[PDB]
Symmetry: D2
Subunit: 417 residues, 4 copies
Amino acid sequence: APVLGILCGGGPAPGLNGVIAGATLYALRLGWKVIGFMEGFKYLCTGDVDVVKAHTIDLTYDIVSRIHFQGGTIIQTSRANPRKSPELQENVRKCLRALKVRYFLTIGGDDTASSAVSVASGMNGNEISVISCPKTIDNDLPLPADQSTFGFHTARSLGMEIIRNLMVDSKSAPRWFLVEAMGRSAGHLALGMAEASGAHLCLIPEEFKQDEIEFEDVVELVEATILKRLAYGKNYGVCVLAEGLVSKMSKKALYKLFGNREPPTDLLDDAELARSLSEELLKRLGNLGIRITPKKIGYELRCADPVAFDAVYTRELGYGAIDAFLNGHSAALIVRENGQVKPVQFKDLLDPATGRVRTRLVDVTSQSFKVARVYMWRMSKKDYENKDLVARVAAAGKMTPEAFTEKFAHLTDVVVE
Amino acid sequence: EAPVLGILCGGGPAPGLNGVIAGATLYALRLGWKVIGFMEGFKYLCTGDVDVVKAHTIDLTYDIVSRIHFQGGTIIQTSRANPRKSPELQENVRKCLRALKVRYFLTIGGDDTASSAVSVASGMNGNEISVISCPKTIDNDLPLPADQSTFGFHTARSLGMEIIRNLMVDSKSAPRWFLVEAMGRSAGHLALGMAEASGAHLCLIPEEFKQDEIEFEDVVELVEATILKRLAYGKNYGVCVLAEGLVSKMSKKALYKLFGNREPPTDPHGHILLDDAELARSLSEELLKRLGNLGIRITPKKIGYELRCADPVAFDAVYTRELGYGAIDAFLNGHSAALIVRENGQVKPVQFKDLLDPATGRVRTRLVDVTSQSFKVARVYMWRMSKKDYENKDLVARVAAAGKMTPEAFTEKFAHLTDVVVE
Amino acid sequence: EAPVLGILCGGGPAPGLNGVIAGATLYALRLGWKVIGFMEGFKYLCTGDVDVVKAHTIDLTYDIVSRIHFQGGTIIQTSRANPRKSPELQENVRKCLRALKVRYFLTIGGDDTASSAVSVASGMNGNEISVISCPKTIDNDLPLPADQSTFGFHTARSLGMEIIRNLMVDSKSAPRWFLVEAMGRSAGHLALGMAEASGAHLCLIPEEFKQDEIEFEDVVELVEATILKRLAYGKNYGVCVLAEGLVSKMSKKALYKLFGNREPPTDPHGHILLDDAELARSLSEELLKRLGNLGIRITPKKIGYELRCADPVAFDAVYTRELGYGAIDAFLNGHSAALIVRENGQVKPVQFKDLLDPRVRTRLVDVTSQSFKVARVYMWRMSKKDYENKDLVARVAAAGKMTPEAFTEKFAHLTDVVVE
Amino acid sequence: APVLGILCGGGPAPGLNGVIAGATLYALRLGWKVIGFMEGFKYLCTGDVDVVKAHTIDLTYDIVSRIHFQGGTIIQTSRANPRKSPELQENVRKCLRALKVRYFLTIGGDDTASSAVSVASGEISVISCPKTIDNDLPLPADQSTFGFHTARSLGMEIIRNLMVDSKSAPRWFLVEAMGRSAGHLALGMAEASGAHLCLIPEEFKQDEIEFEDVVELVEATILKRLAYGKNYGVCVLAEGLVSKMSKKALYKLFGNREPPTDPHGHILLDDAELARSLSEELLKRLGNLGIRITPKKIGYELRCADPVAFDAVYTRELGYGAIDAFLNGHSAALIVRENGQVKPVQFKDLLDPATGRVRTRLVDVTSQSFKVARVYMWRMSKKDYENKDLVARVAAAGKMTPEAFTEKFAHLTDVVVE
Ligand SMILES: Nc1ncnc2c1ncn2[C@@H]1O[C@H](COP(=O)(O)O)[C@@H](O)[C@H]1O
Ligand SMILES: Nc1ncnc2c1ncn2[C@@H]1O[C@H](COP(=O)(O)O)[C@@H](O)[C@H]1O
Ligand SMILES: Nc1ncnc2c1ncn2[C@@H]1O[C@H](COP(=O)(O)O)[C@@H](O)[C@H]1O
Ligand SMILES: Nc1ncnc2c1ncn2[C@@H]1O[C@H](COP(=O)(O)O)[C@@H](O)[C@H]1O
Ligand SMILES: O=P(O)(O)OC[C@H]1O[C@H](O)[C@H](O)[C@@H]1O
Ligand SMILES: O=P(O)(O)OC[C@H]1O[C@H](O)[C@H](O)[C@@H]1O
Ligand SMILES: O=P(O)(O)OC[C@H]1O[C@H](O)[C@H](O)[C@@H]1O
Ligand SMILES: O=P(O)(O)OC[C@H]1O[C@H](O)[C@H](O)[C@@H]1O
Ligand SMILES: [Mg+2]
């Protein structure tokens, strides 16, 4: 009876347990023995056969038969990475061989799969075969457009519900919420939350023409939306911001981001973008009876119980991983393109630019992105050319139609219309 | 004056109806259109009385629709009253639409609603009114490119998943078997989706039965062998999800037995009233006679009326907003007698004649593809006796012993089930 | 060694069972006690074979229970097996408890579980073992001070409200009447709670019927009058919630009509089987004959088992944690054959004798309380004054397509059938 | 036809629509005409009766028959305080008389009720209802203000997700629960979700708190968890710890700077980030041990969640009791529920003599409920500090001697109640 070894690396995503139970349940039906390494590679890195034994468990039918309802991961996860030093990988090989592992499945992000292949490449193919199931809550893998990664549906739906309450609260007690969606990689999650909840505005790094952002431009994009809605008798709303704006700002923009101060280094995590915009917008707009409050959606999504779409999705990835093992595949990533859970070789998907896996961003030319824009509140190219509109909007700001055009009309060159 | 967009909903409600209404109305309002909404579908348009229709038409304004994307149901209600099979009724709808100066006419409903919409258009100048329909089914039975859902389906399946979740915890905490009947006889998409997501131990849908007709006995025994196999592993509990469509695939011998060894009730037109069937209840009643003495409890449970007006999940909120936008886009581009659908992430108008099945003159019905990879994966995790399973003497020994019968008795009673359903 | 604490669950599950288990276990481990849990209640303690019991007992360690307060149901499962009817079985239970050196025996369950625990205790020494039971009922029918809830009732009521909420939107979007049957015949706390919270138009609990036996005709007419009054205001839809206990209060003639003018079902021993009674289904078919010509659709809906194992809401999470703590404190203070309950914000042991009047005194809805009166105001119903309002009776009668004389003679007697 | 005028004051709480629907629907049956003032006292305080009439609506059956399902308020709310100045009450009296409203119903918390009393001194009866998610109105013991159950329940669900994440990917979450008046909400969320630590101002003995003590209280819990093999957890902090802090503590809290202040000299505690500051300090002290720490705010997403069944029933009965108090001629009272009965309680009985405004009900840290909640927390008790064996294990977890651990932490037993 061969041995299967599963582990999780990187941040958790809803439905992580779904993959573990999908692979384990099918493997047990074949008669395999399944084990799970706690906290990813953290203890395989030490190379101590008994420190590892104290941190691996039997993945039995009883353990996994009902985890498909539950978020997080029963075998935990960690960012521990054996790929960064020649000693660590050998410690991994020493423990896999000592554990008589035959099939090796990892569930994790771009940095987690690379560890799997590197440890595998220094091992005989007849003794160990490696498979990985890439995971990401930011929906940034290069699957065919409109196709989502597992966990993304759960994250977007819970985020919609959180913004729903902020939408009702912003109207009931007039204010503006600046909701910062966690995740600097792409803009899929911020735009999905905003469009589903009817958020009045969404800013993502992908909608900016210039290769760097200026702090003042982001202030004016939000300031224009607040002015236009105020011009229609509404002093409240919700604006959603992808954190990826941070990783695109310029050096000067980052300096203003931290309060006109030099930023720390080894550091965009310490950045507080929604909070910084709230302070600047309050100096400019507070006199108009406008309250602004930042709010961060984020960590609370990572271990939400999977929605039905991600339950089916992850189970089919678990079966697929075992199926790739049976069909002899190795060094491949389990993906579902066009409704087929097929093994895909990491070479065929690794974009040569960054070395890591190709990251699919939001297509702001697609119609889907255009539809989201129609239901937002923003001054378009045509809007600035409407004298009657510009008159009311500038009046709402207690500025003249002229000063308003000086300040804000340039924004049509910062963001794709 | 400004062009008038009239909106109605037909058929049974599904999550996201308001989302379609808000997408069409908000976009139209930005274009300066006047948006009105007829209450209860074609109900009053069929009368032909202009005043009555005015008494059941409301002005769809910004503040009314600005926040209904959060809410299930339809703020303009819905009806199934349809004028398609009445030349007089079709004219009556035309007279009321002309009276209200309706330039763009949008219907949100199922097959009957869309067919009625085009029939109203067959006798109207193509430059005075355009007709667009937005297909709606929680049953997911539209012939969209497979694996792509219809709006409302994701919401119904997710809520359906959470109900069965509580039934799975309850069935294990207090050992019991639940027969969950998923309302709707169109297809098995809802049953299989809820069962696969919730990890139910069995899902029976009409698509997997090879015979053109189904026998009540074969359904009893398919569930029975699943229960026995579970019993052979120390587990006297589980959940089985039956698609209601099994009833409409049964033979008349199965119907008489289903209705209590009696005569199926019928309306005053000669049609069997299948809504009065109690599939899940009848099968648990029979299954208790056979397996009850093995310390097995069985309980029916229906799901599906509570699903139809659940608040839409994010996938449906985005979906229906894009559909409502697409309806207005079709109006602008000049399309008419077209249905707004989303294929490959693109909302496009598709002519109604192009969706007809030439054999029936009816829009095609997409059922579960039981030869798909997805369905095979679902079956892998179900608890059932497969073909090669019946050939394992050790396994049939354990299962037969669980049922307090001999191995030869088990093969006699249950081995024919591999020829009843696709393996 | 260290004291052994055995825990089991008996009967129907309710939200928060895991809360009581976790509250008792976590505190017990803080005291150094060993904690064990019996799968499926007394089912295996009845067999007597100790090795079988060991195969169905688990060590309740810190990591087993530290996070089950989120989870509904019970990890140690439950069963209706009760050794209270066989000292052959009670001796078997005592035998396995002694083998496992159970110093403290905490059972969570209903009447059969509670009484079964004390009878086993009666045949043992008061120093070797001590027994405490935590009463459990999702029906809120324990005799606590008025308005104070049993654990799990909040969770069940809130989930039921959500289901009716979907039914209310559906009934209005696609005009229809839903007859929501709230399962449970013990009392009407669940039905009234769900209906009041959800804005349901009518609620019928057996507590409001003045007479001792209920007639099938009268129940039909109480729903009928509400539907007609709604029709008289342009509303041809609504939700009416029926407590399943209406079946248990019906007269012999009423039962005969309820099952379809056939002999009521019965078990092999001759006792009536009310579980086969589809109360909402029968009332829908009957009300369809009478009101179908008016354009009224009526569909039944059952809200039962999906409540039992819903995840506990915050009120019940705090509740059952305080209960579990109180059970350990009762063991420490030397209490035995006692029930752990909470009254006026304090968890405390309460001897069996305090609450018992055969099974425990069933607390029913107080239909004379101000709480029930307020619920009635927001219902749609023909009060005694409504029947005497000539103008109103004309509108309702016309909605039902009958003369005011016919309406008054048929429906006006209902003022003496249910509390005014 | 008598006129009922309804407004909402203060921050929203789930069930406001329940009160409005219960009061409006009953008043409709009595034949009353019902109206609603937008944004609460914002425009009744102005005295411009022309502006007031613009932002008023007629509360009809269609408007309110189904809002009992919905959180938020259909008539909005503001924090405007007519009790601030003598005519701030006068403008309200003038506008109310102009509209000829017989019955005036305010739906708000401690600040709103005091405003209602400031106007109830002159034809027009005034009744309030107990709105607050902070559970800090002086209702009978063990009896909650409406909206508190819903806010606690949704807060528990949010923390549950943070609990699964803190264990799946070992991390510590510092949850800051909104509300500076009392610790009810923070304690309810933490107890129900099984959070490892909770800190509320009610448990500190001295009336001024030091930043160092707050940091060390979390530090002791994190170290103790490490001693027992766990490098993760969740800690809930009532944000009212900032309002109990000393001037020196506030200086450290705002990054060793003078706290921001309003044009009147009072301190702007809204700009404070308690959880963020503690996280930064604790990461400096414990990151080497393998401890990751992350702050999270909860509370703006709680104010307008759809009410739970408890608040739906509660607000339906409170709204009924408001019309019943009006029907009985009562005035200058707040509707309360005790033993399942709604009754008016005069504002005079609820006023604290020193403040002059409605009395704030804090958590009773001497009660059994609080003691039990503490038993399930991970903390160092007075006895634990006297356990030489336990102290050695925690100190080793913190990479320090037992002597150093006792010097730094043992004094905490005099900082908070045991
Ligand atoms: N940026 C915007 N996004 C969405 N709706 C808008 C926007 N600006 C105006 N509207 C609405 O579009 C409709 C027509 O606007 P108008 O033609 O300016 O009266 C009204 O309901 C406006 O409130
Ligand atoms: N019908 C079934 N569906 C899913 N899993 C099953 C089924 N029958 C057995 N198993 C499980 O498959 C694994 C291997 O089965 P066996 O080798 O027969 O013990 C065990 O975990 C069984 O419980
Ligand atoms: N049975 C009832 N329950 C609750 N509200 C009612 C009932 N009957 C009438 N109403 C409402 O009471 C108000 C006064 O009605 P009326 O007495 O007809 O003027 C209106 O909002 C009616 O819809
Ligand atoms: N401060 C605390 N709060 C809650 N549980 C604790 C605390 N300290 C220890 N425990 C647990 O209580 C039990 C007693 O452990 P010990 O004191 O080592 O015998 C073990 O399960 C510990 O993990
Ligand atoms: O806040 P309201 O004016 O009511 O509604 C604002 C709308 O604009 C937002 O993008 C959403 O699509 C909403 O429907
Ligand atoms: O825990 P049990 O009820 O034994 O088994 C549950 C699993 O069996 C079912 O087919 C699903 O695949 C679940 O994952
Ligand atoms: O909207 P409708 O169905 O007409 O009325 C709903 C109300 O009537 C019900 O008794 C409850 O009191 C609800 O508030
Ligand atoms: O699973 P762990 O995080 O170790 O412990 C969680 C428990 O510890 C906390 O104080 C609560 O009482 C929880 O029940
Ligand atoms: Mg206050």
